[PDB]
Amino acid sequence: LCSDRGCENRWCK
Amino acid sequence: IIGGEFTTIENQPWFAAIYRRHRGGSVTYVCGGSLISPCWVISATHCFIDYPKKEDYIVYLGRSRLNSNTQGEMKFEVENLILHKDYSADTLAHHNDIALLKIRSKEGRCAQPSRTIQTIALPSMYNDPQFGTSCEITGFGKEQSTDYLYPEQLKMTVVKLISHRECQQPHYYGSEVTTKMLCAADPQWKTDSCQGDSGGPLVCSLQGRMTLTGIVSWGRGCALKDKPGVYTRVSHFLPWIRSHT
Ligand SMILES: *CCC(=O)N1CN(C(=O)CC*)CN(C(=O)CC*)C1
Known part of the structure; x- marks a missing residue:
């Protein structure tokens, strides 16, 4: 459960 | 929206379009921001927290379209990327979600006011x-x-x-x-x-x-x-x- 606003330009495995 | x-x-006219340059040369849109004085754009820390390297970023002023040039637009590098030290994210909430980008063109200039560029x-x-x-x-x-x-x-x-x-x-x-x-x-x-x-x-x-x-x-x-x-x-x-x- 993540905020879509929050998901910009983020790192992921 | x-x-x-x-x-x-x-x-x-205060709207700033913030992009990130990738090795290989590809540029992607990151986040919006707002021009609060000629040299300063304000935005959100979470947009930058995973890639806090100022060199990576491109900021446009005077731009209406995502992947095209708008007449009178100004392009900037980020001289200073300042994230809020107390930034933190919960399950949904983001705290102290605020960032400052000091901007400068390759010539060393800050924003020049115009019909399309205003604080x-x-x-x-x-x-x-x-x-x-x-x-x-x-x-x-x-x-x-x-x-x-x-x-x-x-x-x-x-x-x-x-x-x-x-x-x-x-x-x-x-x-x-x-x-x-x-x-x-x-x-x-x-x-x-x-x-x-x-x-x-x-x-x-x-x-x-x-x-x-x-x-x-x-x-x-x-x-x-x-x-x-x-x-x-x-x-x-x-x-x-x-x-x-
Ligand atoms: C739930 C929020 C979160 O943990 N992150 C933001 N984000 C997203 O992909 C949300 C759309 C990047 N994060 C990852 O863990 C990607 C693997 C962290």
Whole structure:
């Protein structure tokens, strides 16, 4: 459960 | 921006479009921001927290379209990237979600004012419009939650400010919303900011002055019933802003 606003330009495995 | 309408940069002349340059040379859109003085753009820390390297970023002023040049647009590097030291994210809530980008062109210049490039006023301390007041939001973010691409044309919409009373109701956000945040929504839940709008401006007319009241921060989904957009409350960060400027 993540905020879509929050998901910009983020790192992921 | 979910719903709303297309706009043009003369209508939002403080709007800053922030991109990131990748090795290989590809450039992608990151987040919105707002020009608060010739050398300073204000945005949100979460847009940069995983890639806090100022060299990576490109900031455009005077630009209406995502992947095209707008006549009179100015391109900038980031001289100083300043993230809020107390930034933190919970399950949904983002705290101290605020960032400053000192901008400069390759020639060393700050923004030159024009019809398409203007600063926006900061509010005075703890001085926000009354809840129920209409304010505008602006960005290149998703038009629908199901989209995986951003629109080419800048968008805006109008949302109403929601009281802390209402936004802390259990079917809204409970105590995850704090007094350093502002909630704003469409009464019929049809229009809202969304992914890619983060860091851009929530602008309210205060005394016939356009004022940067909020910075797009977080929310549950986009335009979901009982789930307002949540905004960094700029009027509670003036000491932080003034110090680093
Ligand atoms: C739930 C929020 C979160 O943990 N992150 C933000 N983000 C997203 O992909 C949300 C859309 C990047 N994060 C990852 O863990 C990606 C693997 C962290």
